[PDB]
RNA sequence: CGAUGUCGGCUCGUCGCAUCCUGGGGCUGAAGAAGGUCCCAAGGGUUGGGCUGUUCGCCCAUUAAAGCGGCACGCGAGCUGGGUUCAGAACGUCGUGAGACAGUUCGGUCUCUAUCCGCCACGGGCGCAGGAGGCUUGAGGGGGGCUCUUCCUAGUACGAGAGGACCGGAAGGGACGCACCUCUGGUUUCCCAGCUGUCCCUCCAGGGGCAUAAGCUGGGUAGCCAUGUGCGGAAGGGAUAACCGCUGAAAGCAUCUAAGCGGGAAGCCCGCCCCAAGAUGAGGCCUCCCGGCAGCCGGUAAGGACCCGGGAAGACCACCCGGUGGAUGGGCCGGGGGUGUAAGCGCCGCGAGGCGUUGAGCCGACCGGUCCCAAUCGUCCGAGGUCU
């Protein structure tokens, strides 16, 4: 019974679910848009939005909080410069989910790009 | 568990009865109201690559 | 929560120590023992030539549990032992003062003789 | 109420009643008073 | 609809307001209203909150203290109207919002890991003062 | 027989005389009446309730017919009081008052195909002493070639729960009617925000 | 005998009554209480443990009681394999022997996939003579049904006393069933903190991985939960069993019966809850809808579906909710809640560390707000009402 359980399993053991969010976050901030399954990107969104958030917020604790997750000196310095900016008057809504119209022919997954907002 | 087994050879018409329900349901498509082709609603047109009346994939 | 086969630590001066819970004196099928309970026990352990000695069966009251005890207030007190007061067959402590803490249930269930020993009700 | 196969008068005051199709031998004694099964 | 705004609208007029603040680890002697044969007297447990579950008008403590050798822990509703007054005897310097291993503690080490809290001390007698 | 429709908001306990009763907390009113069974018209006495409203774009026709036929608001559930005359428009907590005795039915927390034990509290088998992958089986089902069969109703596996209850004879710790609270002593069936009904107990 | 797996235990029951308790009653060598016996009665219950493979039995402590039996001495495609009964080994004994026991003793592989009927749940189709959307009723079916102690009655009746009532009320329990998470108590898989080794980021500091599919440890939200909370057994009505009667003839009397009428039980029916119109007998009420070729087709009405966004709803499906008018989910914000004073800095220390900043920082579900991000645009089905 899952009742008002949040976050998905995915499939995946909790450092391995961590490890994902951590990989697919990277490589979103890295690109700004990404192609991933459904359920992946829609429990990514918030795992992103939050990162946003203290780029939003800024400060040297903000900094060492993101790269706790994001573990990397150049991709937190291209958000907290980049990314930081360009949502700074943003609140939520930091990333867009757009479902493809065409599954995954090796196993007919749907897919759907995830894409920091604009 | 000591192996169950099927009894008889199932008759043609009861697999075929058994089967009644394995139809395929028509994907729904909507039109693009960009390019006017057919795709799943929801979703981005890969043909035109629009999406909410604006551009969304580099189709 | 007191159940057979459960050690209780004798709170008076019978000369036991211990006693081994073998069965709970409130209906047939009764599954719990707790506060101002009549359990019916076995002498584990005494101090020697005490009054009972090891191998007696019998009746005690359960006074204090490391299980905590719910109240209509909604306040609940919980020990850390479980006592039992090795009680005659007529509601009487057989022995002569109780040690330690004990349940204000005992009040509320006929046993004021061990209220009145018990050096700190509660 | 004696219940029995063999109802019978026991005194002359054994008096017998087919009552209710079953066989009762109604009596002033108490004891005597029987039931036929 | 808030749901929580009708509990605490609900609970809002049960809720005691006066009881003194005080943390884990410290020590306490609660007054509390006791309805014993038929009249009520006010015995006062004095132990070690060693937990607060915070859970607002339905938030509880729970107090411990050794009655003759005896670990006596008590569990009090935080606002029922039966304690009638809470007295912080001591600002003990707890760690944790759980003190469960005082349990397994003599006493020597019980007053060795709880040491007083020099700042909710020095605050309380900064605090304490009439006009 | 007096019956309100109702909300459950949460549990809580309160301190009535010193004694903290846990009860839960339901938002019954403001329940209007929509339309009144009447025995000729329908073969029995009964009344049907809104309760909560809804958004006009969010109603059939019909429905909304079914309102207009009333001079009542478009609400989101409705429902009957069985043998219930409400002479009011809209049945409100008022009817209740605190100490009487009421029976409540909601849909209790559906915990979806549920296992035998959850179910119906059947032991399982051991834990150790060599059981093989049956340590929560129900065991035996049946008897031998005679009947050979298993009778109805046997206690198996499925949907545990997610339906209608009644809990019966609570009491009414206490009404709000500026708020349109209801405080019942005991638990509720359901979850909170479950619809729920409350009616005049049964028993005596 | 081209296989019907054999004692026992467990799980799960169901049923008979030749009734162990609970209910009713008769008689008594029934003073009361307690009993005995029999009669009617199967609704519910029938405890835990020691010994033994055991069933059985004895014992232990209770209990109202600690029922007897059937169901392939129920139940191994549900479990175990203790015993019996494979192969090894040993003893007593028999046999020259090989070996034998019904005598003993230690050991000894129990086989993932359910086709059908059955059962437990959930659906699709069609039907329910117009189409939908709601509400219902309830044919009928299931669940449940229990029991004890104490107090008053009243130490009253009874009784030399001893002892000790009926009836009628009151309260409190045990087990069981349902529901729920306010409280207690669990978990609470990464929400918080700490610690060890290693390696790495980036040297310090600060962090990350790994140590489990949490490294360990200290906590713990919501949810799920019981050990926690509440609620239940009804009350009552009806016909009855045993049994007890009024009237009463046959049969001048009497007769509970033969005409009749009544009382009469944990019993049956209703009553309580639940399911329920496939109840094909397809029920009832409210509301909404209106042509080209018994029909046919048409777009279609109402409406629905598909499609999302979800949900204490859920295996799927279904059900519910939302769909720009939107707060449905993710964000964010605020509260809750948890962890427990972040980092950084300053100061104090040789340093480990300590102090202030600081109930700080972080913060899963919880409770509301905010349209920031998503439920875009949409498509398709779906009335022309059979006849007396
Ligand atoms: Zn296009
Ligand atoms: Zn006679």
């Not at chain 1, 976050?7 to 990277?26: E, P, T």
């Not at chain 6, 409203?53 to 207009?68: E, W």
């Not at chain 6, 809990?167 to 405080?183: G, K």
Request: proline share 6%.
């Amino acid at each position: 019974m899952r009742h008002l359980k949040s976050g998905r399993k995915l499939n995946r053991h909790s450092s391995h679910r961590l490890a994902l969010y951590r990989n697919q976050a990277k490589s979103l901030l890295t690109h700004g848009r990404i192609t991933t399954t459904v359920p992946k990107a829609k429990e990514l969104r918030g795992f992103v939005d939050h990162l946003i958030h203290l780029a939003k917020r800024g400060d040297l604790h903000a900094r060492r909080l993101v790269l706790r997750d994001l573990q990397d000196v150049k991709l937190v310095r291209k958000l907290f410069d980049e990314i930081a900016p360009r949502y700074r008057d943003r609140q939520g809504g930091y990333t867009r989910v757009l479902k493809l119209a065409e599954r995954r022919r090796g196993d007919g997954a749907p897919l759907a790009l995830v894409e920091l907002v604009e | 568990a000591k192996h169950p087994v099927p009894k008889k050879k199932t008759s043609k018409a009861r697999r075929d009865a058994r089967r009644s329900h394995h139809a395929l349901t028509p994907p729904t498509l909507v039109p693009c109201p960009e390019c006017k082709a057919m795709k799943p609603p929801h979703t981005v047109c890969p043909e035109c690559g629009y999406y909410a009346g604006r551009k969304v994939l580099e189709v | 929560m007191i159940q057979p086969q459960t050690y209780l630590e004798v709170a008076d001066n019978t000369g036991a120590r211990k006693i081994m819970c073998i069965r709970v004196l409130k209906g047939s099928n009764a599954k719990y023992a707790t506060v101002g309970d009549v359990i019916v026990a076995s002498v584990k352990e005494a101090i020697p030539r005490g009054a009972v000695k090891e191998g007696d069966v019998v009746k005690a009251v359960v006074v204090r549990t490391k299980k905590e005890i719910k109240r209509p207030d909604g306040s609940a007190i919980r020990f850390d032992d479980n006592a039992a007061v090795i009680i005659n067959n007529q509601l009487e402590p057989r022995g002569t003062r109780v040690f330690g803490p004990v349940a204000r249930e005992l009040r509320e269930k006929g046993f004021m003789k061990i209220v009145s020993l018990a050096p700190e009700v509660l | 109420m004696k219940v029995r196969a063999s109802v019978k008068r026991i005194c002359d005051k054994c008096k017998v009643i087919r009552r209710h199709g079953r066989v009762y031998v109604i009596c002033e004694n108490p004891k005597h008073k029987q039931r036929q099964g | 609809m808030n749901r929580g705004a009708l509990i605490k609208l609900v609970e809002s007029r049960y809720v005691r307001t006066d009881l003194p603040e005080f943390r884990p680890g410290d020590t306490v002697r609660v007054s509390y209203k006791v309805k014993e044969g038929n009249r009520t007297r006010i015995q006062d447990f004095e132990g070690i909150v060693i937990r607060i579950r915070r859970n607002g008008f339905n938030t509880t403590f729970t107090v411990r203290k050794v009655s003759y050798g005896v670990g006596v822990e008590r569990i009090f509703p935080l606002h029922s109207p039966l304690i009638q007054k809470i007295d912080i005897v001591q600002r003990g310097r707890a760690r944790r919002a759980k003190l469960y291993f005082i349990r397994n503690l003599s006493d020597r080490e019980i007053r060795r890991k709880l040491r007083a809290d020099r700042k909710r001390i020095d605050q309380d007698r900064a605090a304490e003062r009439a006009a | 027989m007096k019956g309100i429709l109702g909300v459950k908001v949460g549990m809580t306990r309160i301190f009535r005389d010193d004694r903290a009763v846990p009860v839960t907390v339901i938002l019954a009113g403001p329940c209007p009446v929509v339309q009144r069974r009447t025995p000729e018209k329908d073969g029995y006495t009964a009344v049907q309730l809104g309760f909560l409203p809804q958004n006009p774009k969010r109603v059939n026709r019909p429905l909304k017919g079914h309102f207009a036929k009333a001079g009542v608001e478009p609400v989101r559930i409705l429902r009957e009081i069985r043998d219930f005359n409400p002479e009011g428009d809209t049945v409100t907590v008022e009817i209740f008052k605190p100490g009487e005795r009421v029976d409540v039915t909601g849909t209790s927390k559906g915990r979806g195909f549920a296992g035998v034990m959850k179910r119906w509290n059947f032991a399982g088998g051991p834990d150790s002493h060599g059981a093989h992958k049956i340590h929560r089986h129900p065991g035996s089902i049946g008897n031998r070639k005679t009947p050979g069969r298993v009778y109805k109703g046997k206690k198996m596996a499925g949907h545990y729960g997610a339906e209608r209850v009644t809990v019966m004879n609570l009491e009414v710790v206490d009404v709000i009617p500026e708020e349109n609270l209801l405080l019942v002593k005991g638990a509720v069936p359901g979850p909170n925000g479950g619809l729920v009904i409350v009616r005049e107990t049964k028993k005596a």
